[PDB]
Design a protein around this ligand. Structure first.
Ligand SMILES: CN1C(=O)N(C)[C@H]2CS[C@@H](CCCCC(=O)O)[C@H]21
Ligand SMILES: CN1C(=O)N(C)[C@H]2CS[C@@H](CCCCC(=O)O)[C@H]21
Ligand SMILES: CN1C(=O)N(C)[C@H]2CS[C@@H](CCCCC(=O)O)[C@H]21
Ligand SMILES: CN1C(=O)N(C)[C@H]2CS[C@@H](CCCCC(=O)O)[C@H]21
Ligand SMILES: *[C@@H]1O[C@H](CO)[C@@H](O)[C@H](O)[C@H]1NC(C)=O
Ligand SMILES: *[C@@H]1O[C@H](CO)[C@@H](O)[C@H](O)[C@H]1NC(C)=O
Ligand SMILES: *[C@@H]1O[C@H](CO)[C@@H](O)[C@H](O)[C@H]1NC(C)=O
Ligand SMILES: *[C@@H]1O[C@H](CO)[C@@H](O)[C@H](O)[C@H]1NC(C)=O
Lengths: 123, 121, 123, 121
């Protein structure tokens, strides 16, 4: 088995691209995220992401999570998933995400959150 | 106006502290739990995230990741900080708890979802 | 303790009310859903729901699922959960839901689904 | 022109069938799995749902509930029926798997979520 590393350049079937840097010995990493599309009426810009990889038992397919701090809207996405060596020997990030929109009144909180799923593959 | 910095709790009986929020929107914090999805002994785990600063809002959205120290899992949270006129702050979140699975054909059952409100503790 | 039954009239935090009729031998039930808020701009009609309670091992706190076929929107909400006897001995539906919007292009499927959670309590 | 009625599969190897959809949008179908979250023997299971017929879309939304016959669980699916240039149909869906828990204090860990595409069998 290889080790499934988070570090490097990734893409998805939405055509978003994301780059993750070194993971430090606390599991932290930083990177950038450029989306191809958007839920808002706003102009897209690349954005920073920050997260961690779980290092408990030093697993080769670790779980992780990261936050995308969108720099062109009031939104936040969080991703969480696992870095897998797929059947064909490629590393793949299997993720799910929550997209939280900003709402003006707490009475609209019920509808502020979308969910989805994305595979990331090495670009 | 609404700020993430503080000690906070939820109805599961978890306590979370988040420290100061830097110019870039970043913070760190701790998360201690009382109930789990594992048999392993509970340890305090660290957390990192960001609050969105766009248009300098007073009820910002945010996300963070909790890096479990007692299991192989990872939980992410995202929500929005709501404040009233008395300055009562509440964090309305949803979360995803990703378990580790040994084989990729098990990925489908690895993700649990739920919501939690956090109150000032 | 008591059998937690879905049959009856319920309410939530959002001010929605719903009535579930009798549960049949197959665990099927039908009902109506009347909402006090939406994520559209139309006028609220009462909407039909249909679902099932799970009757394996005849649990007193059964899981269930149902579909709300919105009569004033091109959307569908599904709910799934468990009928509990709460701490205070009152019957409660603890549910999670997905709200699926119609999108016009397949490329926009990603953004079509919201998620939340609601307790229902007896009206 | 996108319709639910048919025999379907997904990448987990479950096959579903759905019957005719009546004027009231209702259907019934069956669901057979090859993998489960349970240790019990798989049995085929019934499903019930509706397609949304408002403004009579060629690509309607829908939801259904799978009444598991071999565990105490319920799964609900919701999505949209997409049909392409040549009549190729696909159902884009998302689901919630609700497990049974004994105490209300355990409600929080009871729901998993995922996504699946169904294609014609
Ligand atoms: C493009 N996307 C992507 O590659 N995803 C995996 C999903 C999760 S975040 C969303 C984009 C959000 C921009 C924020 C906003 O519009 O509020 C979508
Ligand atoms: C106590 N909890 C809490 O405050 N939540 C909002 C939910 C989401 S994280 C979960 C605890 C997970 C511990 C790690 C593990 O069990 O592997 C539960
Ligand atoms: C009122 N609601 C309610 O009692 N919920 C638990 C949530 C789940 S469905 C949504 C209402 C949707 C109306 C249909 C539409 O907006 O297209 C919201
Ligand atoms: C095979 N599956 C499938 O085709 N899915 C889309 C997922 C969501 S339901 C689950 C099967 C659950 C069986 C019941 C149980 O384990 O209690 C899995
Ligand atoms: C993703 O990468 C490709 C290849 O580098 C580039 O053509 C494309 O524009 C990138 N996507 C975005 C959204 O910038
Ligand atoms: C949380 O806070 C209260 C008082 O500050 C304390 O009694 C309790 O033990 C703490 N919870 C955990 C899970 O350690
Ligand atoms: C819910 O029922 C209550 C009491 O019967 C009533 O005041 C209210 O109108 C109902 N809600 C809606 C949205 O119809
Ligand atoms: C589903 O359909 C395929 C194609 O007919 C068949 O080989 C397979 O056994 C079926 N799967 C299950 C779980 O019944």
């Amino acid at each position: 088995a290889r080790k499934c590393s988070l570090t490097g350049k990734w893409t998805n079937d939405l055509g978003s691209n994301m780059t993750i840097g070194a993971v430090n010995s606390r599991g932290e990493f930083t990177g950038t995220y450029i989306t191809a599309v958007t839920a808002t009426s706003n102009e897209i810009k690349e954005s920073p992401l920050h997260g961690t990889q779980n290092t408990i038992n030093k697993r080769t397919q670790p779980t992780f999570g990261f936050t995308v701090n969108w720099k062109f809207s009031e939104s936040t996405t969080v991703f969480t998933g696992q870095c897998f060596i797929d059947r064909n020997g490629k590393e793949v990030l299997k993720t799910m995400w929550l997209l939280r929109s900003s709402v003006n009144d707490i009475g609209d909180d019920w509808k502020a959150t979308r969910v989805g799923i994305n595979i990331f593959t090495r670009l």
